[PDB]
Amino acid sequence: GTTVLTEAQRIDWMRLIRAENVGPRTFRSLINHFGSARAALERLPELARRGGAARAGRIPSEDEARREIEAGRRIGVELVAPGETGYPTRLATIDDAPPLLGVHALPEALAVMARPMIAIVGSRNASGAGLKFAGQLAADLGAAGFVVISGLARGIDQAAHRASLSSGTVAVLAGGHDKIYPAEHEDLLLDIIQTRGAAISEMPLGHVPRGKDFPRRNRLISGASVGVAVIEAAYRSGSLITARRAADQGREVFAVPGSPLDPRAAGTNDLIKQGATLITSASDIVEAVASILEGEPDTGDRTRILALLGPSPVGIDDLIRLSGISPAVVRTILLELELAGRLERHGGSLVSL
Amino acid sequence: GTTVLTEAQRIDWMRLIRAENVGPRTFRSLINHFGSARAALERLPELARRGGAARAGRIPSEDEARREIEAGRRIGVELVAPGETGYPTRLATIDDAPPLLGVHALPEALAVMARPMIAIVGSRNASGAGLKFAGQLAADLGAAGFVVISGLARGIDQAAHRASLSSGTVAVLAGGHDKIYPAEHEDLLLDIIQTRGAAISEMPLGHVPRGKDFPRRNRLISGASVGVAVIEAAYRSGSLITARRAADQGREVFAVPGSPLDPRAAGTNDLIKQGATLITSASDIVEAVASILEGEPDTGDRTRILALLGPSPVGIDDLIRLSGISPAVVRTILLELELAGRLERHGGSLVSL
């Protein structure tokens, strides 16, 4: 597999993301500014004080971070960073990407995370017809080669996971890998792993999912995908949160239509009114995403690297962390740019356009 | 009311449109080229011969044309041209506008034709829910001030006419004013007239509607409207013909969504996929058309007149015939253009930009 951080670096990444007042956006900026997690961690106390806080912010020790990384390994969870095997590329490109993603899959099956994914979400209280449609859609997308990503929820999510087991499905957990919600889906999650899929989470081990953790996780469902399909949704359905994240991130949103009188079609019909793509079958999605979805650059890779470059020098490390693109592919792109004459190479692995 | 043709001119218009090989597009070009129907009628025999036809094309006499105009008056039908009271303005702007439109309304009620219209069309074999929706939609649009135009068909059309009687509805007939199809809708048509609406037709008196007359009439339903709403439509529904005409003419098309499993939602769902506006209520239409829908020019009038002008001189007659805009309003627009310095006035009422 591809590895981008030393064991010492992964420990420092764990210490930093778990630090008080450090979220995914803070982490990004800290690395952008100080060049490494090690360097960021040193400034953490003085930054807080100079910022005007009363007291020191909590910062996990080296030992606490190491224990958490080992505790995860003991139950089959690998903690991966952008650019590494197991970290889905599209996810690295969101504004608040998780610096470390805990991925639980069979030992040789981590590559499921490199495949193109479609999110299928919708009502927890779903109609019989919605469940049926969600299941057929997931089976059809899987047969076309997509991984189905969803949130292990009651209703639409589980129908989509259940029908995509054999082609590969990913579940995004709202809490720790060892604290599954809903409890009735523990069996399903194990079947997902056993059929060469994966569970992913950014939360600490032992973290019991709380009400507020569910919306937060939705950005990862949309973030890893090349498209989000909403099957059914009344007003106030949590699945419409996934749709809203998808739109913020620039992912295409697909919605299944229904009758104006159908309460479970109110949210999906409204998505369409607001610009989501109306779908009646998997082919509508496949045709839409065909457009986009080894050191060889994939569709979009060159464009995404160019976009992260500018008149101010950046590290190849930074480009990998910010784009999720494998090290080999980023190197190929920078090489293409340089000897087309469009790249300036500076001291210590730093590059400009 | 507004009158644009003398009785002698209307007779010549009747002779010409009823002439062998002269359709609405031919009529337009003949007037564009020869300046009047009288002048066109003289060339008709020599044009046909020089065109390479074997024999003379049939041309109605003055007496036959006059008899048809009088026969229509005897049952309450007025034959109107673009620019006149009773001729709906938007209809005059289609490529194949009827030169004379037979309009049947109460004596003082011809002004219903100047009001903004929304077409409501759909399945002849409609669901209970579709009929209900069509009825509520027509009543709501009518209460907002629109006239509902439709084709007197079984299913969706009649539900829309029935619910819009009191605010005003227009029926487009596939045949003569005295040959109603379906026969079961004779009573309904009379109720439309009695409640200050209208029936319109471009067909001769005594013309029994044939299979092929139905599609031809659909362009008038869409043509007179500022928008066409399709309520339900399976594949091959005749209502999708109205939608296709609407799109060719540049009218906005609205479609009511349904479940992917609903056979009556296949055509409407597909319209949406192809760019029609998804609606779940009258407000979606009202908001969409707000944008657009006395010598005072209305929204769009100035733009439409300017578009018909060019470096080559045209008559004010031509502009009225081609735009459907009242004589007084066209004169106001040309006056605005001229003394803004943008108009050239030539000999014999001819103008250029």
XYZ file of C-alpha atoms in Angstrom:
706
model
C 0.000 0.000 0.000
C 0.954 3.681 -0.158
C 2.300 5.282 3.066
C 2.888 9.059 3.390
C 3.524 9.539 7.143
C 6.161 7.910 9.380
C 4.846 6.339 12.597
C 6.178 9.418 14.466
C 4.234 11.734 12.078
C 0.944 9.780 12.425
C 1.299 10.066 16.220
C 1.783 13.816 15.928
C -1.209 14.039 13.530
C -3.299 12.148 16.154
C -2.103 14.469 18.965
C -2.964 17.567 16.913
C -6.456 16.633 15.624
C -7.436 15.581 19.169
C -6.082 18.839 20.663
C -8.552 21.245 22.249
C -9.888 23.842 19.749
C -8.336 22.076 16.772
C -10.877 20.945 14.173
C -10.308 19.759 10.586
C -10.110 23.374 9.283
C -7.726 24.436 12.073
C -5.536 21.403 11.386
C -5.349 22.294 7.680
C -4.331 25.901 8.413
C -1.805 24.889 11.061
C -0.052 22.564 8.603
C -0.332 25.178 5.820
C 1.404 27.687 8.125
C 3.951 25.653 10.179
C 4.794 22.937 7.631
C 4.298 19.936 9.952
C 2.182 18.726 12.848
C 5.299 18.503 15.013
C 5.994 22.226 14.474
C 2.297 23.117 14.984
C 2.112 21.278 18.326
C 4.999 23.335 19.733
C 3.199 26.601 18.972
C -0.163 25.425 20.311
C 0.364 26.730 23.858
C 1.741 30.168 22.863
C -0.880 30.585 20.064
C -3.725 30.056 22.560
C -2.229 32.514 25.093
C -1.437 35.176 22.449
C -4.940 34.535 21.130
C -6.266 35.755 24.475
C -7.406 32.530 26.120
C -7.290 32.266 29.906
C -5.590 28.869 30.258
C -3.642 26.232 28.297
C -5.640 24.206 25.765
C -5.599 20.421 26.356
C -2.990 18.669 24.173
C -2.804 14.832 24.163
C 0.585 13.392 25.093
C 2.631 11.226 22.748
C 1.658 8.195 24.868
C -2.099 8.914 24.708
C -1.970 9.328 20.901
C 0.091 6.146 20.497
C -2.343 4.200 22.746
C -5.325 5.346 20.657
C -3.560 4.290 17.385
C -2.686 0.886 18.899
C -6.170 0.419 20.457
C -7.607 0.874 16.887
C -5.152 -1.624 15.329
C -6.247 -4.175 17.936
C -9.766 -4.170 16.466
C -8.722 -3.912 12.811
C -8.878 -0.139 12.300
C -6.133 1.572 10.279
C -5.709 5.308 10.653
C -4.982 6.736 7.224
C -4.064 10.229 5.882
C -4.749 11.787 2.448
C -2.608 10.125 -0.242
C -2.475 6.755 1.575
C -4.142 3.456 0.738
C -7.558 3.536 2.391
C -8.112 7.282 2.160
C -10.712 8.087 -0.554
C -9.292 10.842 -2.818
C -12.408 12.948 -3.252
C -12.772 13.214 0.500
C -9.385 14.904 0.894
C -10.634 17.820 -1.281
C -13.455 19.030 1.035
C -12.842 22.205 3.179
C -12.971 20.257 6.420
C -11.487 16.908 5.367
C -10.569 14.618 8.272
C -6.746 14.625 8.669
C -6.909 11.004 9.881
C -9.600 8.621 8.834
C -10.137 5.352 10.731
C -10.905 2.655 8.178
C -12.010 -0.813 9.133
C -11.772 -3.393 6.330
C -10.364 -6.919 5.890
C -6.489 -6.969 5.839
C -6.059 -7.009 2.050
C -9.217 -5.082 1.173
C -8.256 -1.453 1.836
C -8.281 -0.697 -1.917
C -12.086 -0.568 -1.902
C -11.481 3.046 -0.803
C -9.856 3.980 -4.145
C -12.964 3.083 -6.161
C -15.581 5.592 -7.370
C -18.458 5.920 -4.904
C -22.062 6.984 -5.130
C -23.876 7.983 -1.913
C -27.417 6.656 -1.489
C -29.321 8.308 1.343
C -32.911 9.008 2.350
C -35.762 8.593 4.864
C -35.191 6.616 8.051
C -39.009 5.984 7.928
C -39.036 4.894 4.305
C -41.915 3.552 2.200
C -41.912 -0.061 0.923
C -41.497 1.318 -2.583
C -38.582 3.577 -1.543
C -36.739 0.673 0.111
C -37.236 -1.391 -3.040
C -35.994 1.397 -5.294
C -32.950 2.114 -3.029
C -32.031 -1.606 -3.127
C -32.363 -1.902 -6.927
C -30.437 1.333 -7.456
C -27.540 0.224 -5.167
C -27.386 -3.233 -6.843
C -27.367 -1.600 -10.309
C -24.698 0.988 -9.461
C -22.567 -1.765 -7.873
C -22.948 -3.935 -10.949
C -21.699 -0.938 -12.993
C -18.566 -0.803 -10.811
C -19.392 1.806 -8.139
C -18.990 1.423 -4.397
C -22.163 2.471 -2.549
C -21.487 4.733 0.408
C -24.066 5.461 3.042
C -24.521 6.066 6.785
C -25.812 2.749 8.167
C -29.104 4.396 9.048
C -32.542 2.747 9.363
C -34.648 2.875 6.198
C -33.015 3.866 2.908
C -29.303 3.538 3.974
C -29.556 -0.087 5.114
C -31.564 -1.113 2.049
C -28.786 0.349 -0.108
C -25.983 -1.317 1.944
C -27.770 -4.709 1.969
C -28.199 -4.753 -1.826
C -24.603 -3.669 -2.510
C -22.709 -6.100 -0.215
C -21.164 -8.190 -2.960
C -19.993 -5.297 -5.178
C -18.782 -3.266 -2.186
C -20.315 -0.831 0.220
C -18.903 1.667 2.723
C -20.592 2.738 5.976
C -19.774 6.084 7.564
C -20.092 5.896 11.381
C -21.209 8.860 13.490
C -19.134 7.640 16.470
C -16.325 5.250 17.346
C -15.714 2.042 15.398
C -16.727 0.081 18.498
C -19.961 2.069 19.247
C -22.350 1.252 16.389
C -25.670 3.123 15.931
C -28.212 1.894 15.324
C -27.482 -1.146 17.555
C -29.654 -3.316 15.285
C -27.135 -2.704 12.500
C -24.118 -4.340 14.183
C -24.771 -7.519 12.171
C -25.084 -5.613 8.892
C -21.787 -3.764 9.550
C -19.967 -7.058 10.052
C -21.497 -8.323 6.762
C -20.197 -5.174 5.035
C -16.639 -5.890 6.291
C -16.911 -9.624 5.476
C -17.995 -8.893 1.909
C -14.891 -6.728 1.308
C -16.408 -3.312 2.042
C -15.473 -0.929 4.881
C -16.595 1.149 7.785
C -15.090 4.651 8.152
C -15.013 7.138 10.999
C -13.150 10.230 12.146
C -14.301 9.827 15.787
C -12.269 8.431 18.738
C -12.625 4.827 19.858
C -15.307 4.540 22.573
C -17.174 7.591 21.287
C -20.897 6.818 21.631
C -22.738 8.696 18.822
C -24.735 11.655 20.097
C -27.571 13.481 18.391
C -25.212 16.167 17.059
C -22.617 13.683 15.644
C -24.952 12.547 12.863
C -24.975 15.773 10.763
C -21.218 16.124 11.141
C -20.634 12.671 9.578
C -22.839 13.493 6.558
C -20.146 15.653 4.965
C -17.974 12.510 4.751
C -20.712 10.515 3.000
C -21.007 13.228 0.318
C -17.292 14.133 0.494
C -15.991 10.703 -0.499
C -18.606 10.323 -3.312
C -18.742 11.450 -6.940
C -22.487 11.975 -6.536
C -25.218 11.752 -3.913
C -28.581 10.150 -4.633
C -31.554 10.991 -2.359
C -34.287 8.341 -2.629
C -37.084 9.706 -0.371
C -37.101 12.631 2.087
C -39.885 14.477 3.850
C -39.178 18.030 5.023
C -36.574 17.868 7.875
C -35.179 14.484 6.809
C -31.484 14.190 7.883
C -30.732 12.918 4.373
C -31.313 16.487 3.064
C -28.319 17.485 5.206
C -26.171 15.110 3.139
C -27.649 16.799 0.002
C -26.730 20.261 1.339
C -23.164 19.176 2.122
C -22.970 17.625 -1.352
C -23.973 20.935 -2.969
C -21.444 22.944 -0.828
C -18.701 20.522 -1.895
C -19.668 20.702 -5.616
C -20.897 17.044 -5.881
C -23.799 16.355 -8.204
C -27.039 15.674 -6.325
C -29.599 13.199 -7.740
C -33.177 12.879 -6.451
C -35.908 10.412 -7.117
C -39.222 12.181 -7.977
C -42.620 11.422 -6.407
C -46.220 12.603 -6.436
C -46.921 16.136 -5.024
C -49.222 14.443 -2.504
C -46.530 12.031 -1.262
C -45.065 13.405 1.990
C -41.831 11.439 1.396
C -41.393 13.214 -1.959
C -41.541 16.784 -0.571
C -37.790 17.047 0.066
C -36.652 15.217 -3.064
C -39.074 17.145 -5.319
C -37.795 20.364 -3.817
C -34.155 19.326 -4.473
C -35.094 18.943 -8.103
C -36.804 22.371 -8.178
C -33.545 23.828 -6.799
C -31.354 22.122 -9.457
C -30.726 18.506 -8.460
C -30.839 15.941 -11.284
C -34.073 13.943 -11.508
C -33.379 10.184 -11.643
C -35.614 7.254 -12.307
C -32.800 4.687 -12.630
C -29.086 3.988 -12.220
C -28.425 4.857 -15.883
C -29.279 8.576 -15.174
C -26.475 8.619 -12.613
C -23.986 6.610 -14.718
C -24.521 8.931 -17.695
C -24.085 12.005 -15.500
C -20.822 10.933 -13.845
C -19.211 9.193 -16.885
C -17.644 12.622 -17.550
C -15.330 12.223 -14.518
C -15.490 8.894 -12.569
C 0.505 3.387 -11.278
C 1.826 6.977 -11.418
C -0.705 7.704 -14.201
C -2.950 10.771 -13.630
C -6.732 10.235 -13.704
C -9.452 12.512 -15.123
C -9.412 15.755 -13.144
C -6.076 15.150 -11.411
C -4.061 17.591 -13.565
C -6.754 20.281 -13.241
C -6.983 19.844 -9.433
C -3.172 20.073 -8.961
C -2.914 23.180 -11.174
C -5.687 24.792 -9.088
C -3.715 24.289 -5.864
C -0.666 25.978 -7.369
C -0.090 29.730 -7.499
C 2.600 32.423 -7.372
C 3.500 31.377 -3.797
C 5.631 28.209 -3.236
C 4.020 25.029 -1.768
C 5.411 21.600 -0.773
C 4.662 18.359 -2.597
C 3.566 17.192 0.934
C 0.976 20.001 0.950
C -0.380 19.111 -2.473
C -0.827 15.432 -1.466
C -2.487 16.339 1.868
C -4.788 18.894 0.173
C -5.773 16.856 -2.949
C -5.758 13.237 -1.737
C -4.003 12.242 -4.970
C -1.301 9.518 -4.650
C 2.378 10.721 -4.314
C 3.359 9.044 -7.606
C 0.581 10.843 -9.551
C 1.345 14.282 -8.036
C 5.029 13.845 -8.945
C 4.042 12.950 -12.548
C 1.854 16.081 -12.816
C 4.531 18.439 -11.459
C 7.028 16.845 -13.865
C 4.635 17.426 -16.798
C 4.211 21.067 -15.791
C 7.914 21.729 -15.222
C 9.242 20.469 -18.531
C 6.391 22.083 -20.384
C 8.101 25.147 -18.850
C 5.215 26.114 -16.550
C 6.720 25.212 -13.180
C 9.314 26.863 -10.971
C 11.209 24.611 -8.567
C 12.494 26.241 -5.345
C 14.707 25.173 -2.411
C 13.585 22.205 -0.290
C 10.904 20.583 -2.460
C 8.806 23.775 -2.896
C 7.040 24.642 -6.157
C 5.301 27.626 -7.861
C 3.400 28.409 -11.116
C -63.026 46.270 -30.467
C -59.928 46.562 -32.658
C -60.363 45.854 -36.410
C -57.379 45.579 -38.805
C -58.946 44.186 -42.019
C -61.807 45.596 -44.126
C -64.601 43.138 -44.960
C -63.088 42.848 -48.478
C -59.655 41.993 -46.954
C -61.072 39.331 -44.572
C -62.790 37.710 -47.578
C -59.504 37.655 -49.471
C -57.716 36.252 -46.375
C -60.384 33.478 -46.240
C -59.977 32.729 -49.980
C -56.186 32.504 -49.628
C -55.880 30.314 -46.491
C -58.441 27.895 -47.984
C -56.589 27.779 -51.336
C -55.017 24.494 -52.401
C -51.365 24.166 -51.244
C -51.571 27.252 -49.048
C -50.895 26.554 -45.367
C -50.171 29.008 -42.530
C -46.453 29.232 -43.497
C -47.264 29.713 -47.199
C -49.788 32.418 -46.318
C -47.182 34.266 -44.232
C -44.605 34.183 -47.049
C -47.132 35.193 -49.696
C -48.103 38.285 -47.692
C -44.430 38.997 -46.875
C -43.678 38.928 -50.624
C -46.780 40.418 -52.356
C -47.921 42.842 -49.634
C -51.590 41.760 -49.541
C -53.810 38.718 -49.923
C -55.497 40.344 -52.918
C -52.137 40.596 -54.729
C -51.156 37.043 -53.665
C -54.388 35.532 -55.026
C -53.716 36.963 -58.496
C -50.312 35.271 -58.665
C -51.556 31.931 -57.333
C -52.300 30.412 -60.754
C -49.042 31.519 -62.447
C -46.935 30.599 -59.351
C -48.278 27.022 -59.418
C -47.652 26.644 -63.181
C -44.148 28.194 -63.028
C -43.576 25.962 -60.009
C -44.051 22.975 -62.311
C -47.487 21.714 -61.303
C -49.638 19.983 -63.909
C -52.935 21.814 -63.335
C -54.448 24.877 -61.626
C -54.640 24.756 -57.824
C -58.175 25.117 -56.390
C -58.906 28.709 -55.295
C -62.200 29.499 -53.483
C -64.337 32.167 -55.139
C -65.267 35.427 -53.442
C -68.798 34.042 -52.950
C -67.618 30.798 -51.297
C -65.360 32.724 -48.874
C -68.138 35.202 -48.053
C -70.619 32.329 -47.452
C -68.201 30.631 -45.037
C -67.679 33.928 -43.091
C -71.461 34.481 -42.918
C -72.196 30.813 -42.031
C -69.819 31.279 -39.005
C -71.483 34.553 -37.906
C -74.834 32.744 -37.936
C -73.633 30.468 -35.122
C -71.703 33.125 -33.192
C -68.204 32.629 -34.619
C -66.079 35.693 -35.420
C -63.134 35.260 -37.748
C -60.278 37.344 -36.396
C -56.739 38.221 -37.639
C -53.587 39.082 -35.634
C -53.924 42.511 -33.990
C -57.735 42.275 -33.675
C -59.913 41.805 -30.609
C -60.237 38.059 -30.094
C -56.852 37.089 -31.504
C -54.458 36.081 -28.670
C -51.148 37.964 -29.148
C -48.728 35.176 -28.312
C -50.348 32.965 -30.913
C -49.542 35.385 -33.737
C -45.794 34.919 -33.012
C -45.565 31.168 -33.825
C -44.017 30.112 -37.222
C -47.298 28.716 -38.485
C -49.817 31.050 -36.833
C -53.357 30.770 -38.217
C -54.046 33.835 -40.431
C -57.727 33.688 -39.415
C -58.885 32.298 -36.136
C -62.562 31.434 -35.590
C -63.476 32.483 -32.062
C -66.776 31.633 -30.463
C -67.594 33.644 -27.324
C -70.564 35.639 -25.979
C -71.082 38.979 -27.874
C -69.259 41.228 -25.391
C -66.763 38.652 -24.130
C -64.124 38.552 -26.880
C -61.581 40.264 -24.586
C -60.987 36.988 -22.741
C -58.535 36.371 -25.612
C -56.261 39.260 -24.530
C -55.608 37.750 -21.091
C -52.517 35.705 -20.157
C -53.110 31.976 -20.611
C -51.621 28.838 -19.159
C -52.157 25.535 -21.013
C -53.046 22.520 -18.869
C -52.819 19.223 -20.729
C -52.265 15.547 -19.975
C -53.519 11.937 -20.110
C -56.889 11.170 -21.674
C -56.873 8.075 -19.347
C -55.971 10.023 -16.231
C -55.681 8.826 -12.625
C -58.120 10.050 -9.935
C -55.228 11.915 -8.347
C -54.202 13.519 -11.672
C -57.753 14.748 -12.335
C -57.860 16.220 -8.834
C -54.504 17.940 -9.246
C -55.429 19.301 -12.740
C -58.674 20.740 -11.293
C -56.966 22.386 -8.291
C -54.186 23.763 -10.490
C -56.663 25.284 -13.022
C -58.788 26.809 -10.204
C -55.647 28.274 -8.570
C -54.211 29.710 -11.798
C -57.638 31.192 -12.634
C -57.889 32.744 -9.191
C -54.461 34.332 -9.860
C -55.852 35.905 -13.052
C -54.867 33.451 -15.815
C -57.135 32.005 -18.476
C -56.763 28.212 -18.701
C -56.412 26.956 -22.253
C -56.786 23.333 -23.174
C -58.100 20.993 -25.891
C -61.462 19.749 -24.577
C -60.074 16.235 -24.353
C -61.196 13.414 -22.024
C -59.217 13.161 -18.786
C -56.922 16.021 -17.774
C -58.221 18.716 -20.239
C -61.857 18.527 -19.123
C -60.926 18.497 -15.434
C -58.949 21.698 -16.034
C -61.770 23.346 -18.076
C -64.446 22.362 -15.513
C -62.513 23.881 -12.591
C -61.707 27.112 -14.458
C -65.185 27.989 -15.835
C -65.784 31.007 -13.638
C -62.346 32.633 -14.093
C -62.280 31.854 -17.825
C -61.218 28.958 -19.958
C -60.532 28.517 -23.677
C -61.041 25.290 -25.655
C -59.092 24.657 -28.848
C -61.138 22.527 -31.294
C -59.528 20.046 -33.689
C -62.342 20.542 -36.240
C -65.188 22.896 -37.095
C -67.022 24.905 -34.438
C -70.129 22.827 -35.149
C -68.392 19.371 -35.031
C -67.338 18.880 -31.399
C -65.080 15.967 -30.325
C -65.494 14.299 -28.004
C -69.308 14.314 -28.447
C -69.734 13.938 -24.672
C -68.132 17.366 -24.276
C -70.768 19.375 -26.179
C -72.381 20.332 -22.853
C -69.059 21.376 -21.318
C -68.240 23.563 -24.363
C -71.540 25.406 -24.007
C -70.761 25.934 -20.282
C -67.370 27.384 -21.274
C -69.076 29.917 -23.604
C -71.816 30.697 -21.043
C -69.252 31.418 -18.334
C -67.502 34.011 -20.547
C -64.761 31.796 -21.991
C -64.280 30.800 -25.650
C -63.827 28.066 -28.167
C -61.218 28.597 -30.918
C -60.542 26.849 -34.202
C -58.723 27.366 -37.484
C -60.756 24.649 -39.279
C -63.700 25.150 -41.701
C -67.295 24.880 -40.530
C -68.564 21.294 -40.955
C -65.069 19.840 -40.613
C -65.420 16.617 -38.594
C -62.161 16.130 -36.608
C -60.022 13.312 -37.966
C -57.235 11.437 -36.232
C -54.575 13.671 -37.809
C -56.317 16.992 -36.889
C -55.581 16.560 -33.181
C -51.764 17.053 -33.280
C -52.141 20.015 -35.617
C -54.375 21.851 -33.097
C -51.864 21.329 -30.256
C -49.565 24.063 -31.556
C -52.421 26.536 -30.947
C -52.885 25.392 -27.338
C -49.178 26.024 -26.634
C -48.975 28.960 -29.082
C -51.570 31.122 -27.339
C -50.136 30.343 -23.841
C -47.325 31.838 -21.764
C -46.596 28.357 -20.420
C -47.757 24.764 -20.786
C -48.326 22.512 -17.787
C -48.371 18.712 -18.310
C -50.144 16.945 -15.429
C -49.756 13.217 -16.290
C -48.498 11.510 -19.467
C -47.452 7.959 -20.222
C -45.102 7.403 -23.168
C -47.017 8.240 -26.419
C -49.548 10.510 -24.695
C -50.819 13.181 -27.174
C -50.230 15.767 -24.441
C -46.449 15.337 -24.988
C -47.065 16.670 -28.509
C -48.327 19.913 -26.955
C -45.111 19.928 -24.826
C -42.950 19.486 -27.948
C -44.733 22.319 -29.766
C -44.328 24.457 -26.639
C -40.557 23.861 -26.627
C -40.250 24.632 -30.411
C -42.134 27.897 -29.842
C -39.977 28.883 -26.812
C -42.807 28.563 -24.194
C -41.846 27.347 -20.745
C -42.957 23.763 -20.101
C -44.023 22.683 -16.584
C -44.484 19.043 -15.531
C -45.900 17.444 -12.461
C -43.528 14.752 -11.056
C -44.528 11.200 -10.075
C -43.040 7.948 -8.822
C -40.646 6.074 -11.215
C -43.066 3.140 -10.999
C -46.099 5.217 -12.043
C -46.757 4.633 -15.762
C -48.554 8.009 -16.001
C -45.402 9.753 -14.728
C -43.037 8.357 -17.401
C -43.619 11.201 -19.875
C -43.749 14.019 -17.330
C -40.652 12.753 -15.466
C -38.828 12.577 -18.767
C -39.853 16.177 -19.626
C -38.227 17.234 -16.396
C -35.042 15.253 -17.176
C -34.916 17.114 -20.517
C -35.314 20.578 -18.899
C -38.985 21.210 -18.131
C -39.735 22.930 -14.808
C -40.908 20.606 -12.028
C -44.138 21.879 -10.423
C -46.015 20.778 -7.375
C -48.407 23.759 -7.297
C -49.691 26.841 -9.115
C -47.186 29.076 -7.288
C -44.259 27.389 -9.199
C -45.877 28.508 -12.447
C -46.852 32.002 -11.221
C -43.299 32.639 -9.993
C -41.839 31.424 -13.287
C -44.013 33.565 -15.574
C -44.172 36.728 -13.376
C -41.112 37.835 -15.393
C -43.282 38.375 -18.508
C -47.086 37.817 -18.159
C -54.509 51.729 -24.421
C -51.545 52.340 -26.765
C -49.192 51.438 -23.878
C -46.572 48.738 -24.667
C -46.502 45.635 -22.440
C -43.491 43.644 -21.190
C -41.727 42.170 -24.215
C -43.550 44.258 -26.825
C -40.639 46.645 -27.526
C -38.159 43.747 -27.728
C -40.424 41.739 -30.089
C -40.960 44.721 -32.460
C -37.225 45.529 -32.562
C -36.543 41.866 -33.436
C -38.855 42.037 -36.463
C -37.048 45.108 -37.773
C -33.855 45.052 -39.829
C -31.969 46.845 -42.608
C -34.782 46.015 -45.074
C -38.045 48.073 -44.979
C -41.292 46.491 -43.631
C -44.901 47.746 -43.339
C -46.649 48.538 -40.067
C -49.285 46.046 -41.435
C -46.560 43.369 -41.529
C -45.417 44.050 -37.983
C -49.008 43.771 -36.649
C -49.702 40.556 -38.618
C -46.367 39.014 -37.522
C -46.404 40.051 -33.808
C -50.106 40.055 -32.883
C -49.551 43.314 -30.988
C -52.387 45.907 -31.231
C -52.006 48.685 -33.921
C -51.903 51.425 -31.257
C -49.026 49.722 -29.370
C -46.955 49.063 -32.529
C -47.345 52.729 -33.529
C -46.162 53.815 -30.039
C -43.072 51.569 -30.295
C -42.091 52.798 -33.772
C -42.561 56.380 -32.542
C -40.275 55.695 -29.547
C -37.620 54.240 -31.847
C -37.821 57.010 -34.446
C -37.398 59.988 -32.152
C -34.716 58.208 -30.201
C -33.096 58.407 -33.666
C -33.058 54.649 -34.314
C -35.725 54.413 -37.011
C -35.766 55.264 -40.700
C -39.147 56.059 -42.242
C -39.548 55.296 -45.977
C -42.227 55.907 -48.641
C -45.685 54.385 -48.106
C -45.628 53.435 -44.416
C -42.412 51.339 -44.628
C -39.797 51.304 -41.859
C -36.165 50.176 -41.252
C -33.608 50.036 -38.378
